[PDB]
């Protein structure tokens, strides 16, 4: 569920100082500053990290700070892009991971009129059925959800699911 | 990297043999879901065990042969706390049970590869007899 | 499991400011995910060394760890009071994570 504590991603570090040193040199702009971040996790090349904090009010006091720099650099502080990602949507993708085995791409896929995107997922040599059809709605999509029930793919029958954030029991 | 980090057993006792017990792990100072937890037991007057990990950012778990199958690692980020229910008890699993974390977070899947366990509980006792 | 440490000598007598070697061998190859620990009774292991040769911050530079192929050596240059405890070491290379049987480091007399 990609974690319950609240994060930030700051950017543009100075990768010539070690991870244990940016840990640090972040920790005390912040707390220069009057805020009380959890834990710092330098990235794997030192050029960026995730900062946590102990509540969403903490989060939002620490992205209205500007001008911090940290051994030279100035960081910035972003609020990694999973709100445009399927945060906001998967109310607007569906799947319909295929229950059978491997089919053809182009094999006359009339089921759906309006969709952008019916790609399935295969690998070297055979393949098992994972093929999600993206949407263009807005009020969720189930005009497609409780639409399909029960086509019929090669091999025998199929169904049809969420992904992401959606689907996740 | 400054919040103080701890981490708090809780749930050990006693526990007839063939009977389940479930130790809690609350973990402060980090964020539970980017590290890696681990459950060490020492049975008395025996060395350190390796029990069984967890990586909820990988959805990665490892669990030590003596018992595989029987225990089981879970957590519950929204607690920001590490479980491990013990099923199948025996006279041999009676020890002190610690749960440690790792040194630095999962910046890489290899993290694994290197560091070491950073914070320790106190641990706490888990007794199994009739 | 399936890998494990053979540590030896699983005890040894020293005085204080005597050089100690502990060494442990894996039974496979973990290349350098070798980490090295302290335990005194009562309380709960303290990390040493980490990658078999990288000082955990805090720890006295006395401590040292080496890498030879599959046997990885932890090192006190001079023996200290305090250093008197059951050292561990541990593996995290291959699949579940193994600790060795322990070295116990008792006072000579």
């Known amino acids: 569920g990609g974690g319950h504590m609240f994060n930030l991603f700051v950017g543009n570090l100075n990768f010539n100082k070690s991870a244990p040193e940016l840990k640090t040199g972040i920790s005390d702009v912040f707390a220069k500053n009057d805020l009380a971040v959890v834990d710092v996790r330098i990235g794997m090349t030192r050029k960026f990290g995730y900062v946590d904090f102990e509540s969403a009010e903490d989060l939002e006091k620490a992205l209205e700070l500007t001008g911090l720099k940290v051994f030279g650099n100035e960081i910035k502080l972003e609020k990694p892009k999973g709100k445009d990602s399927k945060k906001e949507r998967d109310a607007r993708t569906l799947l319909a991971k295929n229950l059978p085995y491997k089919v053809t791409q182009d094999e006359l896929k009339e089921v759906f009129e309006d969709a952008a995107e019916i790609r399935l997922v295969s690998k070297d040599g055979k393949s098992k059925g994972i093929a999600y059809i993206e949407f263009k709605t807005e009020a969720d999509a189930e005009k497609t959800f409780e639409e399909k029930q029960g086509t019929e793919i090669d091999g025998r029958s199929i169904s049809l699911y969420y992904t992401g954030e959606k689907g996740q029991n | 990297e400054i919040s103080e980090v701890q981490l708090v057993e809780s749930g050990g006792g006693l526990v007839q043999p063939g009977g389940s017990l479930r130790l809690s792990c609350a973990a402060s100072?980090?964020?539970?879901?980017?590290?890696?937890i681990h459950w060490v037991r020492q049975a008395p007057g025996k060395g350190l065990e390796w029990v069984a990990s967890?990586?909820?950012?990988?959805?990665?778990?490892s669990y030590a042969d003596s018992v595989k199958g029987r225990f089981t690692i879970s957590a519950d980020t929204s607690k920001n706390t590490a479980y491990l229910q013990m099923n199948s008890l025996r006279a041999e699993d009676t020890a002190v049970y610690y749960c440690?974390?790792?040194?630095?977070?999962?910046?890489?899947?290899?993290?694994?590869?290197?560091?070491?366990?950073?914070?320790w509980g106190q641990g706490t006792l888990v007794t199994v007899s009739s | 499991s399936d890998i494990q440490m053979t540590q030896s000598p699983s005890s040894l007598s020293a005085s204080v400011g005597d050089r100690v070697t502990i060494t442990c061998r894996a039974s496979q190859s973990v290349s350098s995910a070798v980490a090295w620990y302290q335990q005194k009774p009562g309380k709960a292991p303290k990390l040493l060394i980490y990658?078999?040769?990288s000082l955990y911050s805090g720890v006295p530079s006395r401590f040292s760890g080496s890498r030879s192929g599959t046997d990885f050596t932890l090192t006190i240059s001079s023996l200290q009071p305090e250093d008197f405890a059951t050292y561990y070491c541990?593996?995290?290379?291959?699949?579940?994570?193994?600790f060795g049987q322990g070295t116990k480091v008792e006072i000579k007399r």
């Open positions: 990658s078999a040769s």
């Open positions: 967890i990586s909820p950012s990988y959805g990665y778990t």
């Open positions: 541990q593996q995290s290379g291959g699949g579940p994570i193994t």
């Open positions: 100072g980090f964020n539970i879901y980017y590290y890696s």
């Open positions: 440690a974390r790792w040194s630095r977070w999962a910046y890489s899947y290899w993290s694994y590869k290197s560091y070491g366990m950073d914070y």
